[PDB]
Scaffold this active site. Structure first.
Site, PDB file in Angstrom:
ATOM      1  N   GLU A 261       0.834  -1.176   0.000  1.00  9.14           N
ATOM      2  CA  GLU A 261       0.000   0.000   0.000  1.00  9.14           C
ATOM      3  C   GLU A 261       0.877   1.238   0.000  1.00  9.14           C
ATOM      4  O   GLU A 261       1.792   1.407   0.831  1.00  9.14           O
ATOM      5  CB  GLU A 261      -1.018   0.036   1.142  1.00  9.14           C
ATOM      6  CG  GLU A 261      -2.011   1.198   1.013  1.00  9.14           C
ATOM      7  CD  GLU A 261      -3.218   1.078   1.925  1.00  9.14           C
ATOM      8  OE1 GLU A 261      -4.229   1.772   1.681  1.00  9.14           O
ATOM      9  OE2 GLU A 261      -3.164   0.280   2.886  1.00  9.14           O
TER      10      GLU A 261
ATOM     11  N   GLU B 126       2.095   8.368   7.188  1.00  5.17           N
ATOM     12  CA  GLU B 126       1.805   6.970   7.488  1.00  5.17           C
ATOM     13  C   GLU B 126       2.920   6.006   7.080  1.00  5.17           C
ATOM     14  O   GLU B 126       2.899   4.824   7.438  1.00  5.17           O
ATOM     15  CB  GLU B 126       0.430   6.576   6.935  1.00  5.17           C
ATOM     16  CG  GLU B 126      -0.684   7.165   7.800  1.00  5.17           C
ATOM     17  CD  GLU B 126      -2.095   6.757   7.418  1.00  5.17           C
ATOM     18  OE1 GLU B 126      -2.909   7.673   7.161  1.00  5.17           O
ATOM     19  OE2 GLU B 126      -2.408   5.543   7.405  1.00  5.17           O
TER      20      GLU B 126
ATOM     21  N   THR C  65      -7.130   5.921  -2.938  1.00 11.38           N
ATOM     22  CA  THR C  65      -7.516   7.274  -3.373  1.00 11.38           C
ATOM     23  C   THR C  65      -7.362   8.354  -2.292  1.00 11.38           C
ATOM     24  O   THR C  65      -7.025   9.484  -2.622  1.00 11.38           O
ATOM     25  CB  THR C  65      -8.929   7.350  -3.983  1.00 11.38           C
ATOM     26  OG1 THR C  65      -9.906   7.047  -2.982  1.00 11.38           O
ATOM     27  CG2 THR C  65      -9.084   6.388  -5.164  1.00 11.38           C
TER      28      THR C  65
ATOM     29  N   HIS D  94      -4.953   8.465   0.027  1.00  7.35           N
ATOM     30  CA  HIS D  94      -3.544   8.792   0.065  1.00  7.35           C
ATOM     31  C   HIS D  94      -3.132   9.454  -1.224  1.00  7.35           C
ATOM     32  O   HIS D  94      -2.406  10.446  -1.212  1.00  7.35           O
ATOM     33  CB  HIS D  94      -2.713   7.545   0.332  1.00  7.35           C
ATOM     34  CG  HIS D  94      -3.009   6.876   1.662  1.00  7.35           C
ATOM     35  ND1 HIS D  94      -2.894   7.518   2.852  1.00  7.35           N
ATOM     36  CD2 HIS D  94      -3.400   5.569   1.957  1.00  7.35           C
ATOM     37  CE1 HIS D  94      -3.213   6.671   3.851  1.00  7.35           C
ATOM     38  NE2 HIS D  94      -3.525   5.479   3.304  1.00  7.35           N
TER      39      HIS D  94
ATOM     40  N   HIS E  26      -7.947   0.795  -2.905  1.00  4.87           N
ATOM     41  CA  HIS E  26      -8.896   1.331  -1.933  1.00  4.87           C
ATOM     42  C   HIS E  26      -9.601   2.549  -2.458  1.00  4.87           C
ATOM     43  O   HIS E  26      -8.968   3.482  -2.971  1.00  4.87           O
ATOM     44  CB  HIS E  26      -8.201   1.724  -0.634  1.00  4.87           C
ATOM     45  CG  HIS E  26      -7.964   0.579   0.313  1.00  4.87           C
ATOM     46  ND1 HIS E  26      -7.074   0.649   1.312  1.00  4.87           N
ATOM     47  CD2 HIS E  26      -8.537  -0.694   0.380  1.00  4.87           C
ATOM     48  CE1 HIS E  26      -7.085  -0.510   1.996  1.00  4.87           C
ATOM     49  NE2 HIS E  26      -7.981  -1.327   1.418  1.00  4.87           N
TER      50      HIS E  26
ATOM     51  N   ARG F 166     -12.196  10.564   4.495  1.00  4.14           N
ATOM     52  CA  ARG F 166     -12.394   9.168   4.908  1.00  4.14           C
ATOM     53  C   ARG F 166     -13.815   8.823   5.372  1.00  4.14           C
ATOM     54  O   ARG F 166     -14.024   7.757   5.937  1.00  4.14           O
ATOM     55  CB  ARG F 166     -11.370   8.773   5.986  1.00  4.14           C
ATOM     56  CG  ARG F 166     -10.341   7.736   5.549  1.00  4.14           C
ATOM     57  CD  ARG F 166      -8.933   8.266   5.748  1.00  4.14           C
ATOM     58  NE  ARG F 166      -7.901   7.253   6.015  1.00  4.14           N
ATOM     59  CZ  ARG F 166      -7.643   6.164   5.288  1.00  4.14           C
ATOM     60  NH1 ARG F 166      -8.352   5.848   4.221  1.00  4.14           N
ATOM     61  NH2 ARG F 166      -6.666   5.364   5.660  1.00  4.14           N
TER      62      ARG F 166
ATOM     63  N   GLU G 293     -13.358   2.064   1.851  1.00  2.00           N
ATOM     64  CA  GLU G 293     -12.695   2.224   3.130  1.00  2.00           C
ATOM     65  C   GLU G 293     -13.084   3.536   3.810  1.00  2.00           C
ATOM     66  O   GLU G 293     -13.050   4.602   3.198  1.00  2.00           O
ATOM     67  CB  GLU G 293     -11.189   2.158   2.950  1.00  2.00           C
ATOM     68  CG  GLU G 293     -10.483   1.940   4.276  1.00  2.00           C
ATOM     69  CD  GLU G 293      -8.981   2.100   4.209  1.00  2.00           C
ATOM     70  OE1 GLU G 293      -8.419   2.240   5.307  1.00  2.00           O
ATOM     71  OE2 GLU G 293      -8.359   2.086   3.110  1.00  2.00           O
TER      72      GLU G 293
HETATM   73 MN   LIG Z   1      -6.089   2.100   2.455  1.00  2.00          MN
END
Ligand SMILES: [Mn+2]
Ligand SMILES: [Mn+2]
Ligand SMILES: [Mn+2]
Ligand SMILES: [Mn+2]
Lengths: 297, 297, 297, 297
Positions: free
Chosen positions: D147, D153, D181, D183, D206, D212, D241
């Site tokens: 990912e 992160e 999407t 990130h 994702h 979010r 997500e």
């Molecule tokens: Mn994710």
């Protein structure tokens, strides 16, 4: 309260009572609350019967037309202007008798590509004429809703701002704007900004893609439109619009220049449109809720 | 007429007179007319000199800081909290003495990725403190402008709306929002909608791309931002920020996680950004006038 | 070695040598380095003088026209079609003698709203004829670029994919596409997608806003357009296009339905369009490179 | 065959058996065909009972983790690196035991806000390490999916381009990109552009909004995304997500910084997302089809 309708011509141009059943049934099966008709002959159509079937299905009805050359209410030719007034009177009568509350479409001038620039006189003649017609309409339980259309479909009112200025000029409290997203994307500076500027004077909304095919398969920012409609608390009707050469009359095909057909199945078209609109609206509502959420811990 | 600023850290981290001079010069040669400083050494820097050097150049100035962990005015530790007020009071005075009228940055909590969820008592603690710090700032002829930042950089004020509610909690008439387009694009439901929502309570603005590089080279809808600013008639200062780890202090470089460098040439970066912001606001202004044009023949 | 141009009719519609002179000097003051002329009569204009004045200024030149209903090369009536070919042949010799490489515009059918739906024979005729006129053009050292226009201005080629197919049918390698953002936004499913689909078949581009006024003042997504051109590595000419009722001749005002004028100051308009296209492309250049950046430590 | 899936943290922050099984049921009720268990502790979990209910519910399964600090395979300290290999080996196993085809999440380095700028050594170490683990996963019939996350992160892979280069360095044919999407909107220059650049090497996607929460209630251009995916013929898994303060961990929640109550009704959330992705993709498919329609008469 608010109805989401569809234009009859997605389904059928035919005014045959049998084709009218299929139109109304398709409208209902596709998920819509409202039908908009653009042609009805009392001579061929039992208006009284038709009105009852529309109620029996739980549908609402709107009537929109586009003035013909020989019915241009803004014409210096007084005889032409008079047929324009006559058509509008017939259209109001029909709308009242049918159960509807809105007369929409191109009401201010003739529908088509004009071969002459507009004049102040034209503007004023149309305004004085609509002033009176709007009275007739009020007495009938009906509102007038001026559709704002692109340069190639009328030379007079192309812009919501133009619409607003005209409406003031009329002096009527029974004239409102009919905005169409297909037309707005050509003529407005921002579609969302136009809608905001027009808050409170919007009586009716057409939802049509930049090319008039499937919603979302074109260039119009629909999220921007649904946000603006939400920002202003628009709670009146809105109707899907798309056309095929196979279905519409050839007066209309040659006039709205439908040279190519962007779909073949109208039930698929309408069904998509209805989910697109439904979900676009839901999203916009949720988004407006989120903006103002305090999120105190 | 309101100033189009830039942040110093674009130019260097250093507070040394020799760099201060380069920073100001570069700022001018780029087309900006306000400089934003974050760090200004109390012992090594002549204030009244810098205050003169700034006005001489026809530059405005603003001061933004990010409260350190050991100085979080929202902490239950009355000592750590106390350290914060002194940091604030000292920043107010430096601002006043420098000829600026706004203190900005992360003012309501520690700058960094917190370890616990926000609390109601943390919230009230910050508001109670800032309420009193605001009157100090008033006496100094300065305004407080709370930067609203992304989740990773504070746990307390991430949103314009919660930023608006926080200010109601202080009861202060001298606290305003500092909005930053880089943060807003992460946390806000819709950047333009959030701007509309905060109208009249916005005191300062940071223009920064989604990735913190060149304007228009990321994912932010800057046209929508400019339109919103224009719509609410915003007339206050704004600055460009964009950071390089080869340029900024390793402290901020780790706090805002600059791992990559998107640019090497900060003059080209600043000239581009100035043209971007200027044309952008011009374009949005012409667009808002056009929306309202009566286009009466 | 690409040029950024502007259409003469932004400045003047007149062929007077003093007006042609002005057009050129205005072009240069605005920062453009090509000029597009719509049509010039050889007996009316000192062509070689013009060509010498164009080269002295450092400008390139393109010629665009729209075939008259009088000269539609798709027509069944042979005499009408022959009039087309003769207008085409003359326009080529004009371009050639002026020191230009491109003949553009509506070259495939009559410019205007058509009263008949399109037919395959119309298609084949136009293809067959243009296949020949392309040879004439090659010999003269000039390319033919077919302008793709909206439904209301031609009934044949409204879509970049239609053009591709059409070109395919001509069997020629001197017939390319002339795309126009104003037309694309009405007809294409996605402006960027359509550009991408047309890679290596694009000979010329018109930059024009959705309402044909100031760039960025409408609904077109220009970043998406500059991104698409950049993705396909478009290395050829493109020109700004905006018209005013006040300046153009009544034929064009009426065919393109210019009923209202969105600007009054065409120097401001041009300089702005120059910065917008200039910046827009630089930004798209910056970003397409960022995408690819490896950013390894 | 590919599935539209969902992240377990929509439903639960728990690895308790009944909670896991509720998750499955909720997944199916919401119209989803795949479940992704993120940050699952397999201790005290009846794998067989779980794998049985997946079969009954007709679900695919994926397993996603983010490496902890003391399990960072990119660390110099060999003890820390070997533990990260053991975590990966363990999660490969669980995936295979549960009938999964994919390991996913932050697999390349420690999931959190690093206090250290990356190094070539860290890069190379992680790559050589994952090249081995890939062979392990191949043997278990499982793909690795790195990912790519935002700067806060991870400090190593933030960009599809970086990830692409990284997979070049591992030499493997069993490591793929896992793009998100959320990130991408922070890190990428353009999300569609990033997706087109990574084409062919994209293993898992994702779908998550800027903040979010609800799809479409934030700043992300989802149309552009569904367009790009369609253009590259993406034919692999993608999953919704979303995070809210209502369901939280003390690990993933802390790392992702979730402070706000964006939703409480996770079934409404999921059904909206399911309709969003569903409709977005159909719309994308219709649009791409339209782009290349010849529309020859
Ligand atoms: Mn994710
Ligand atoms: Mn309409
Ligand atoms: Mn900032
Ligand atoms: Mn053109």
């Amino acid at each position: 309260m608010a109805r989401i309708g569809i234009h009859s011509f997605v389904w059928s141009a035919s005014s045959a009572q049998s084709e009218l059943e299929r139109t109304l049934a398709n409208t209902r099966d596709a998920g819509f609350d409202l039908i908009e008709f653009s042609y009805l002959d009392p001579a061929d159509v039992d208006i009284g019967r038709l009105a009852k079937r529309i109620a029996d299905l739980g549908l609402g009805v709107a009537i929109s037309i586009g003035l013909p050359a020989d019915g241009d209410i803004s014409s210096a030719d007084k005889a032409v202007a008079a047929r324009g007034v006559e058509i509008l009177n017939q259209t109001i009568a029909l709308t009242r008798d049918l159960g509807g509350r809105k007369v929409a479409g191109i009401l201010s001038a003739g529908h088509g590509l004009q071969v002459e620039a507009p004049t102040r006189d034209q503007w004023n003649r149309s305004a004085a004429a609509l002033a009176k017609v709007a009275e007739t309409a009020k007495a009938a339980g009906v509102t007038l809703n001026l559709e704002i259309v692109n340069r190639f479909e009328s030379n007079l009112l192309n812009t919501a701002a133009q619409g607003l200025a005209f409406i003031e000029d009329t002096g009527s409290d029974n004239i409102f704007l009919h905005l169409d997203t297909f037309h707005m994307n050509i003529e407005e500076a921002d579609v969302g900004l136009a809608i905001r500027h027009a808050a409170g004077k919007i009586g009716y909304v057409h939802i049509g893609e930049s090319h008039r095919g499937f919603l979302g398969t074109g260039n119009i920012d629909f999220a921007a439109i649904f946000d603006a409609l939400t920002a202003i608390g628009y709670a009146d009707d809105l109707s899907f619009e798309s056309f095929s050469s196979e279905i519409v009359d050839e007066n209309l095909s040659k006039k709205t220049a439908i040279w190519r057909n962007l779909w073949t199945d109208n039930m698929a078209l309408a069904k998509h449109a209805r989910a697109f609109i439904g979900l676009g609206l839901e999203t916009a509502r949720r988004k407006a809720e989120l903006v103002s959420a305090r999120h105190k811990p």
